[model samples]
Target: ATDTGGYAATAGGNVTGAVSKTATSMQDIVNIIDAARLDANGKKVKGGAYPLVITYTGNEDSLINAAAANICGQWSKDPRGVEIKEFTKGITIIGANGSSANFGIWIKKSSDVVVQNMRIGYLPGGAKDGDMIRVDDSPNVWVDHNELFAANHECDGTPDNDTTFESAVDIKGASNTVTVSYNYIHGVKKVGLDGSSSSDTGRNITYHHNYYNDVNARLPLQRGGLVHAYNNLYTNITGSGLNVRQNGQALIENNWFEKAINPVTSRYDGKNFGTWVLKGNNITKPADFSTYSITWTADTKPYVNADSWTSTGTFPTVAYNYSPVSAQCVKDKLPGYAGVGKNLATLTSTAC
Candidate 1:
């Protein structure tokens, strides 16, 4: 409600709160952020010595289903929920509507943070850092109206085969300015990661009114910087979507891609590729990809398929001031105002 639509503008902890605590358990919001504030040898104050507003409320989904029913244990030596290390003051962990949590929300090296309407599901350290909302080396953050889910298959041999679950929002190092709005991410597979590898790249993100379904790729594997995907509502993407690799510069607009597959690609890194500019999307060209049954596959190594919908680069004049709402009104009212039993409701532009 503090204009956290993109490039996170930090109004977190809702401003004037020297303290406003209330957690039910995730180690009691990690023991109330390890006792809220301190320093000068008393330690505990890297980003915490003031503002706070924890309000979790309880329901750990039966201790996260008994630790995801022991997915081969040794889970990072048993780590589970609410870490928020390096505190840096500003905070806001809202929930409380049939509050739920299978655990996961590890914002490190903090900044002004805010995670709302939480309902983080199925998380057990899937290998190393089971992310259901991980914005490391944090900056101004704002992951709103949560509903992160799991189970996209792959726990079988799980060592080099990769664990079963991992990301939902994994913005990495230099976490510079994020804003994953109206969340309702579904059966994720890796649905988030802006700069985690390839020497971890730049940042300045913003994905509005989210409502993705049956996700299977990184609608955000973006590596470099500046992504601004708008009025979201993607459906059944099987392997690729904005993979904009290590040269990132997306601006995919007025979104609504149904039956997706490589919705806006750039893959595996064959060579620096990474660029997007598709506007007012609803499947722009190539004949709307056969009426939105969009599908494509034929990889030889590197990729960059927007299927001729045009504009493969140029983005940098979006200083925030949203009003999108078309693309068939985000596929019809964006599942009724994105996620979380409405109320966090948004979607102006007069609903198109």
Candidate 2:
């Protein structure tokens, strides 16, 4: 299952013969997910199904507050195959303004939780921290087919540094074995982060078939992890892209990069330590590593020896049955099938 951390092949969020539950208000959504409570409308809520569909009801927007932390789980167990998605119409979950209300979602210590086809963000000039979605110490979590952007602005242009927003999706802490596929993430300063701390050995995370448009660096900033990024489309990256630093290892293969200042770099945040294995990428503006200094000086922090790490290795093959299309073809196919409201029913049919 794409839900598995190792990139196993399974139909994501569409498990056959699974039970279905609908959520209307934010509280209802929380109740259904966290407590396995029956819907207020009296829908049958079962706890044993391998794949449970939690569909949103209202078309109105949901203004959430940060105090509603981890609306899903913390030490929750075996809640595999939980699919949170929109029903027929679009649902936008916006974060409330003010420091106290900086709302966000967190998936911690869970498995097989899929969040798809939803819009998560805050307006421009809103809160600066509080990432829209955070996966912490979880495995087999799939974040797919969502449109995650800054609430206040369109992602078509450059960001005004006055306002800051956190990563759209942050896979942090010991969260290993995850997949972020076919989503549109943009208009945020930090696109994403694989690991946040030196002790976080977050490993085997896969980013495939997504669209990253008009953002600053950290797509994503790897602290310490093994990441496989393939067939992703990156556009208008102002600061940089594909940061593999702090003892991280990345296999960047068959991705498409356009108009990015720094497409791929092994150094970030005044520290350099990582291995970047680049292969078959289509880059328009070659990456600028001018600021990347390899020389060790007295002032420089001790470099984590990349010499000990092997930079060349075969890209891990996924069991998804379909292989990534040519890198050059990503631009033609990604937009049609990458974000929210996409025809995910036929996701495998249109491969790129």
Candidate 3:
């Protein structure tokens, strides 16, 4: 849409004929939204909600980040801003090329958001805090058909003694009802898909049909539960394809893992108080690439090994045809060939 106005705390103004245009900065986008609200009598609809559709045509990452953060400030209680739903469609974000601000899309605090068909990448900031999409404590989110490239680069500015590994998609807090699907992520170090720490309650999560290449170098301290991840592809990861800790009632199935040092790993340090299940996944350690395999690491002394841990159950065959497998394989082979032991038998051949 045409440049409306600059950012405004209150939404109202001349918005009629707010025709097609693009933004030079995030604040500019905010101004446009304010104009839209003003034009549509948005402010008059007290206690009601309206959808803000943001379409980005610019190739700058900082502009997008600033705009998103500005919108987030309005929706967050931290700043006591209004709660609004944001629907982002058809945006292309180019990272800082060699700077940390190169991320395509970033959000600090937001909820009830939908982002689809967005391309984010080429971030130059190689710092531990750098990532393509940084969604913290956000809820009711849907991300689909997004493309990410070489985003998170561990910066030299980061402390050498830092305890955590940097990743592309970093998630934390009480995030729920998140659906990530049909995205392509690659050419990054450390991790692709990552998460940690729940707010003790959240549910209805789904991750399917996304591609993660070279992921999981970093592991979350907390486990997963009430989360379902399936039908994704893992190309090259040093750390495991999936990492679960302190999780509860999670469902993992039908994903393909190739050239990973460790395809899957589930461990508990007693600090975890959740349940998890893995099934119908194809774990193949190829013979070609040395740097393209997944790795597994769980301290056994704490009795956190994968074998002795995890809750088991029977799910519908729509999720998988075979039983679940362990993070630690039985002599390098996956555990439960057929709905055996904690594993549930599948009714069909479809990968769950």
Candidate 4:
């Protein structure tokens, strides 16, 4: 919500009021969304909207079951999605142990939603299909200042399917005009994915000023969307970084890639590789895209190329409304101010 001028003017949700209600359990959180036609005070909501604040007042062991997972309102149908009006200090949402069949938090078919300053999915022992956060089929959303980890423990260097959590954050389906900033994504195989489908052409996303540390791959693996990834810090990456494939269009710039292998490349799935524009990236290993191959077919999906297609002629025009910190300083500034415990004012100023 704080990134673009168009998004700020059109889709900024109501975040002005004081917190109207505080939630102590998973049912309280889910009830807030179920009662979309009413505000926290049980008054009839106007415009089919509840522009109220919902805050979490729970301990670290609070566990919300996957069956009771909450969904924000529909974007086209509802006036506004469930809004976390402000950064509530001292609030943490943790998943229960051995519960990994679903996500800790799911945002689907929603708009104008802001999620900030929450600790999600610090599952110590690994679980099956355990994704920390999942944002599917949504738009005009801003996810900022959260700690997202697949598992609470360190990842062993194994490629087993059941080893670690799936992704820290997954943005797929027709999600558009979204910004993910100033979060810590770690201890996972895949950091995130932009478009999981070959026909998903509605992804207009920005990933900026976040820290991806000790992740294996897919510091998002893009499928077929337009993405602007800039001014982020990627450190201690064990596997490939920034896999743009299946006709995805990306503008990658001003990023710091430290000790990462295959930092930037047009990955191949025997069908197609992505088209990208790169500039101003400071990488530890010198990037050589030409030496990369075009024959990997492990997870390749069949995608048709457009006739007489032209790659993006210009870099993506990202709004400077939120001042971005220098890429050179993101490695130093991110760890201190990006996660949940830190001050929000420090993150806004230092992360840019």
Q: Count steric clashes of candidate 3.
A: 35
Give the per-residue lDDT of model 1 (tens digit) for 1-352: 5678788888778787558899997788888878787654677665787788888888877765665566445234444657787776788899887788877898988888898888887787677776788999898889987888765556566666665677888889998898999898987778898988987989899988899888888889999888898989989988777788888889999898889887788878788988888888887788988898888775788777888889988998998777887878878888777666576788887766
Tens-place lDDT digits, model 3, residues 1-352: 2110111011111123224334444454555544544425445332113344544443555643553343222111111111222322212221111222233345434554544445555443333354556545665455555665552233332445221223455555555445555556665555433355444444345555556665544322224545566655665665544544554545666565666644445443445544446565553222322333434456543423333223354332332222322322221221122111212211122322
lDDT of 4 by residue, 1-352 (tens): 3443222212233344323455564466666544644555877544324444555554443332321221111111212112222212111222222222122456666555566666664432233434556567766666776777543233454236344345677788866767777777776667777777656544777787778877777778777767778778887677667776776777777677776655655554656677667666653222322222211122355432211122333545655454555666665666777667664434344344
Which should have the higher TM-score, number 2 or number 4?
4
Residue 75 local lDDT, model 4: 10
Model 4 misplacement above 4 A: 1-13, 16-19, 39-48, 61-103, 123-129, 152-163, 284-314, 319-322, 346-352
Superposed on all Cα atoms, the candidates' RMSDs to the truth, in angstroms, are 17.2, 9.4, 12.4, 9.0
Worst 10 residues of 4 by lDDT: 71-80
Model 2 lDDT per residue over 31-73, tens place: 6554343454556444322355666543323332321232222
Instruction: Give the residue spans of candidate 3 off by over 4 A.
Output: 1-30, 34-49, 61-101, 124-129, 151-157, 160-167, 189-201, 218-224, 267-270, 273-275, 284-295, 298-352
What TM-score, over all chains together, does every model reach?
0.34, 0.69, 0.58, 0.70
Task: State each model's CA lDDT, in order.
Answer: 0.81, 0.57, 0.42, 0.55
Worst 10 residues of 3 by lDDT: 3-12
From the highest lDDT down, the ranking of the candidates is 1, 2, 4, 3
Model 1: what TM-score? 0.34
In model 1, the worst 10-residue window by lDDT is 70-79
